[PDB]
Design an enzyme around this catalytic site. Structure first.
Site, mmCIF file in Angstrom:
data_model
loop_
_atom_site.group_PDB
_atom_site.id
_atom_site.type_symbol
_atom_site.label_atom_id
_atom_site.label_comp_id
_atom_site.label_asym_id
_atom_site.label_seq_id
_atom_site.Cartn_x
_atom_site.Cartn_y
_atom_site.Cartn_z
ATOM 1 C CG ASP A 56 -1.031 -0.071 41.660
ATOM 2 O OD1 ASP A 56 -2.093 -0.713 41.465
ATOM 3 O OD2 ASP A 56 -0.656 0.362 42.768
ATOM 4 C CG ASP A 58 -5.691 -2.267 41.981
ATOM 5 O OD1 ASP A 58 -4.860 -1.797 41.178
ATOM 6 O OD2 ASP A 58 -5.468 -2.359 43.219
#
Lengths: 339, 5
Positions: free
Chosen positions: A32, A220
């Site tokens: 992440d 992201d």
């Protein structure tokens, strides 16, 4: 010195095997770039209702001789409202055979997420608060910082290769770049936030027409789709043929006909001449019931997630505060150099 | 999913 780590394409997320503790307990955790904390699912966690949070590995602190409690509560809430709570600790973390000692992590005992998350963003974005915004622990060295500090990589940097939509695996390289996996030149873009890995997105060309943007977009790995400010998403939706559906009271999602024409591409223009082109099939997300979400959704946070990132090679450099991007080239050939 | 703000 670089560290290549395989990314498992799970569907909505990309995950990697990371071993934790003296006994190398294997966790399969989401990689992440949009968060900064590494948390693991405790073997005695109470998953959220309906959530299978233990099928991707669990961590038993008590069987690790090296685990230390920090005595502070951890709470995180992600952009979609997903939450995890637990306590902070430290232990050995091992990534593709390279171990870092004394890495601060959270032992999570309640979560709505299916598996743990390895947040690799800026330390300034660590979730160090309680649910009221009261701080419970200081900012600290997260995984990429510790890799550098312990001499495992030279620079706090990593390259992201999610690989193609049909690929089972991709690669993240800590401290290195694979120069075989893109066309053209990597274009270094300045990061426009000190907390988020955002670069300036100048425009989007959708169905052949340009839509001026000019603001930052978060790159992201931990977001499935793409998110734009409501007014901008609505302009794109009108052009694309997407429809905002109130799926439950005060809950809205864009849907698009599953038979929509996806022959075209959506083009993202960035600084310094950089362009990333995305095939339009990335914007029709099958729900598996004959309906399809659009691959763009509204938000008060602009995010280019996996449906974008699969089409770029990205070198994130958290020390230089740049993200270098180029159109991806899918190849098993590699020419990895250290960064 | 949408991973921290």
């Amino acid at each position: 010195d670089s560290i290549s780590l395989s990314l498992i394409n799970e569907g909505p997320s990309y995950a990697s095997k990371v071993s934790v503790g003296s006994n190398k307990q294997q966790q399969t955790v989401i990689i992440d770039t949009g968060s900064s904390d590494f948390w693991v699912v405790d073997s005695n966690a109470q998953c959220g209702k309906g959530v299978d949070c233990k099928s991707s590995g669990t961590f038993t602190p008590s069987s690790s001789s090296s685990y230390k409690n920090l005595g502070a509560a951890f709470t995180i809430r992600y952009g979609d409202g997903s939450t995890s709570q637990g306590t902070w600790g430290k232990d050995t973390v091992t990534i593709n055979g390279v171990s870092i000692t004394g890495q601060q992590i959270a032992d999570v005992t309640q979560t709505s997420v299916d598996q743990g998350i390895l947040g690799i963003g800026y330390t300034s974005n660590e979730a160090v608060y309680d649910t009221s915004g009261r701080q419970t622990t200081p900012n600290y060295d997260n995984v990429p910082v510790t890799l550098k500090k312990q001499g495992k990589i030279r620079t706090n940097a990593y390259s992201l290769y999610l690989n193609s939509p049909s690929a089972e695996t991709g690669t993240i390289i800590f401290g290195g770049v694979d120069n075989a996996k893109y066309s053209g030149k990597l274009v270094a873009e300045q990061v426009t936030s000190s907390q988020a890995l955002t670069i300036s997105l100048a425009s989007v060309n959708l169905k052949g027409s340009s839509f001026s943007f000019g603001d930052g977009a978060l790159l992201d790995s931990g977001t499935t789709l793409t998110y734009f400010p409501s007014d901008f998403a609505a302009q794109l939706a009108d052009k694309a043929g997407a429809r905002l559906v109130q799926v439950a009271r005060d809950q809205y999602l864009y849907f698009i006909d599953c038979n929509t024409d996806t022959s075209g591409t959506t083009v993202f223009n960035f600084g310094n001449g950089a362009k990333i082109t995305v095939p339009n099939t990335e914007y029709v997300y099958q729900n598996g019931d004959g309906t399809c979400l659009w691959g763009i959704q509204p938000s008060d946070d602009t995010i280019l997630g996996d449906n974008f990132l699969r089409h770029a090679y990205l070198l994130y450099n958290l020390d230089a505060n740049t993200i270098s991007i180029a159109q991806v080239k899918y190849t098993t050939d590699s020419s990895i150099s250290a960064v | 999913v949408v991973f921290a703000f």
